Structure 1
Amino acid sequence: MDDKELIEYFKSQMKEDPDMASAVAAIRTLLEFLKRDKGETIQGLRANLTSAIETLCGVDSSVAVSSGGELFLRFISLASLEYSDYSKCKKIMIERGELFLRRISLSRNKIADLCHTFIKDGATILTHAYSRVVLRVLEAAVAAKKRFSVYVTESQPDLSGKKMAKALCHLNVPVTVVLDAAVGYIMEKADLVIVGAEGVVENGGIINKIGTNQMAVCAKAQNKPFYVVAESFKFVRLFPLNQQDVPDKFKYKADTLTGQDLKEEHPWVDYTAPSLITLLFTDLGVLTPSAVSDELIKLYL
């Protein structure tokens, strides 16, 4: 598959299912590229897949796409380690990739089933930006006959908080939209904080929409629980030390890529340290942040 056809396939996959995650669509596109590959060697296939991953990351700058590409690369490497013959290797790769897609298509249901029991009846939940996983968790909580109130931040500049508020109003849930600046004003009302994640870094922290770090800090100040819901394919092998240690390709969008109305090209993601996170609700279960690194240490090496 050429670069243009890869981009078209990825965009069509995203468009056909709006609820499909970007990382899942990228992994499916990578599997299609593997199926359509013509090479007869492992190294050539690896190079072609790396080029495809670079193309997809150029299309979409989210950490989820990069983590999905890295996961697929590790998957083909694990398949190649066991089997020396390339034909059997490719056949097993195709079968296990189909199984992998089928399994990761059900991550959100497992996350919701595991997480909906943590929402106490008659509680207030504070949320940042839009997140399909959080929406599914709240759907499951509502279906379990639980009444709760929701505060959602506006999440400037794309105002995805209003979209999340409309989605929650569709489910007949009392939802109130607050300003980002008002987060510290409203934390005293929230019983718990639930946010998604665009990627889970090695130490267990997360890389999420800008404004999540200050929400986590305010929650830690008032000793409120901070819960993250994220699928396993969002695990990345990154170890930022501060906000500037996050790679620049993730902070600034694809189309985006002094001292006077500069604005310094407002970042889109920030890093939240694992010390500000109480629990993670992945498709692998309910984990402490320290468990996340384990899933990577066993994945490689």
Structure 2
Amino acid sequence: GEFDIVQVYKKFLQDDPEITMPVAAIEALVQLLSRSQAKTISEFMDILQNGSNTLKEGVQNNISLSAGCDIFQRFVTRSLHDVGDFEQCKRHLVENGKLFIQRARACRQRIAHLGYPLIRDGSVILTHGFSRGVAAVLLAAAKRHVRFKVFVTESRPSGSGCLMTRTLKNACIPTCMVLDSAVSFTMNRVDLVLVGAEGVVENGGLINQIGTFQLAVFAKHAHKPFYAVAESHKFVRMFPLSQYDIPFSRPILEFDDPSPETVDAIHNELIMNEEQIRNNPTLDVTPPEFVSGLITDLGIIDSKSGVSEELIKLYL
């Protein structure tokens, strides 16, 4: 009995940082599953949820795993039956677990040798902040020896842009970091925009970092296409109503109440404070009419109605 699976989850991040957070969760559940010794089907699903939720609430109720955790459950729940030997249950169960992990680990690869030809000779690409998805495909393209250049949004408040350029610069790729306020000015140059994904919705929506829809309309207005890479285990069952209807933990964009009683053209270091920042949101949502093609291990999906057929296929 581990009784602290989060550590195994955590330990995975140090045994390998090159894996996504949900991947560790599943890789941890199997360790729970394999070691768990039960006697009823209900016993498994009881601690499984009570393990997933235990794993959920530990990580600020992150969405990426919250999908993967729920999808994984509803996966093994499918072709589950108990005939004669009870041990057959666990057998069919955990064996499919590794089988799911197999596809899960190979998912972020399957998109690479599938989205790399989207880059053409001498083309110029744009990316909002770092994402493990857009990275490999570019590298799996640059590996093929193809000339191209790339801008990267600085991606406040994450600042993941400063890391993304390095990962590309290190891989022999020309970069040019650009402020979040100057993406529109860049659309004239760019031939194709490309971002990762943090969550795909029932309507084909796109929950990713805070500024995706900021540039999604630009490419829509600047007539350049829009592409986003999303692994299967990022489909979610929610369904918003706009670019705003999302549940968010901390309340956002509150105002202050000012009682009548109180007190170089580039002015660096004159910004908001950390307290001012966290009032601002963290995630974004681009309605499907603004994306022209999802990039998944299941392939490239453009209808953003078939995503539901695929989403229905993913769940029961």
TM-score of the pair, normalised by structure 2: 0.87
Q: How far off its partner does 1:135 sit? A: 0.9
**1:234-249 to 2 correspondences below 5 Å:** 234-249=234-249
Alignment match, 1:297: 312
Alignment match, 2:6: 7
Q: How far off its partner does 1:83 sit? A: 3.6
- The runs of 4+ residues in structure 1 deviating greater than 4 Å are 261-264
Is the 8 Å Cα contact of residues 281 and 287 (structure 1) preserved in structure 2? Answer: yes
| SS of equivalent residue, structure 1 residue 125 | strand
Partner Cα separation in structure 2 for residue 178 and residue 84 of structure 1:
60
**1:34-73 to 2 correspondences below 5 Å:** 34-60=33-59, 61-73=61-73
Q: How far off its partner does 1:99 sit? A: 1.6
Alignment match, 2:294: 280
CA offsets 1:95-136 (integer angstroms, 9 cap, x no match)? 111121122211122101110101111111000111111110
Q: How far off its partner does 1:262 sit? A: 6.0
Is the 8 Å Cα contact of residues 209 and 270 (structure 1) preserved in structure 2? Answer: yes
Alignment match, 1:19: 18
Is the 8 Å Cα contact of residues 76 and 96 (structure 2) preserved in structure 1? Answer: no
Is the 8 Å Cα contact of residues 75 and 315 (structure 2) preserved in structure 1? Answer: no
Partner Cα separation in structure 2 for residue 151 and residue 263 of structure 1:
24
User: Runs of 5+ in structure 1 lacking a partner?
Assistant: none
Q: How far off its partner does 1:171 sit? A: 1.0
Alignment match, 2:162: 162
- Matched AA of 2:282: W
Partner Cα separation in structure 1 for residue 14 and residue 150 of structure 2:
29
Q: How far off its partner does 1:275 sit? A: 0.7
| SS of equivalent residue, structure 2 residue 177 | strand
Partner Cα separation in structure 1 for residue 136 and residue 234 of structure 2:
17
CA offsets 1:142-198 (integer angstroms, 9 cap, x no match)? 122210010000011231101000000011111000011111121221111111101
Is the 8 Å Cα contact of residues 243 and 287 (structure 2) preserved in structure 1? Answer: no
**1:93-132 to 2 correspondences below 5 Å:** 93-132=93-132
Partner Cα separation in structure 2 for residue 38 and residue 247 of structure 1:
37
Partner Cα separation in structure 2 for residue 277 and residue 46 of structure 1:
37
TM-score of the pair, normalised by structure 1: 0.91
- Identical amino acids, percent of aligned pairs: 43
Q: How far off its partner does 1:225 sit? A: 0.8
- Matched AA of 1:156: R
**Bigger proportion of residues as helix:** 1
Partner Cα separation in structure 2 for residue 270 and residue 278 of structure 1:
17
**1:247-262 to 2 correspondences below 5 Å:** 247-249=247-249, 259-260=255-256
Q: How far off its partner does 1:84 sit? A: 5.1
Is the 8 Å Cα contact of residues 76 and 93 (structure 1) preserved in structure 2? Answer: yes
How many residue pairs match? The answer is: 294
Q: How far off its partner does 1:79 sit? A: 3.5
Root-mean-square deviation (Å): 2.0
Counterpart check, 1:220 vs 2:220: yes
| SS of equivalent residue, structure 2 residue 285 | strand
Is the 8 Å Cα contact of residues 199 and 236 (structure 1) preserved in structure 2? Answer: yes
**1:259-274 to 2 correspondences below 5 Å:** 259-260=255-256, 265-274=279-288
Partner Cα separation in structure 2 for residue 282 and residue 220 of structure 1:
22
User: Runs of 5+ in structure 2 lacking a partner?
Assistant: 257-274
- Matched AA of 2:255: G
Is the 8 Å Cα contact of residues 207 and 269 (structure 1) preserved in structure 2? Answer: yes
Partner Cα separation in structure 1 for residue 144 and residue 278 of structure 2:
46
Q: How far off its partner does 1:291 sit? A: 2.4
Alignment match, 1:30: 29
Partner Cα separation in structure 2 for residue 142 and residue 275 of structure 1:
30
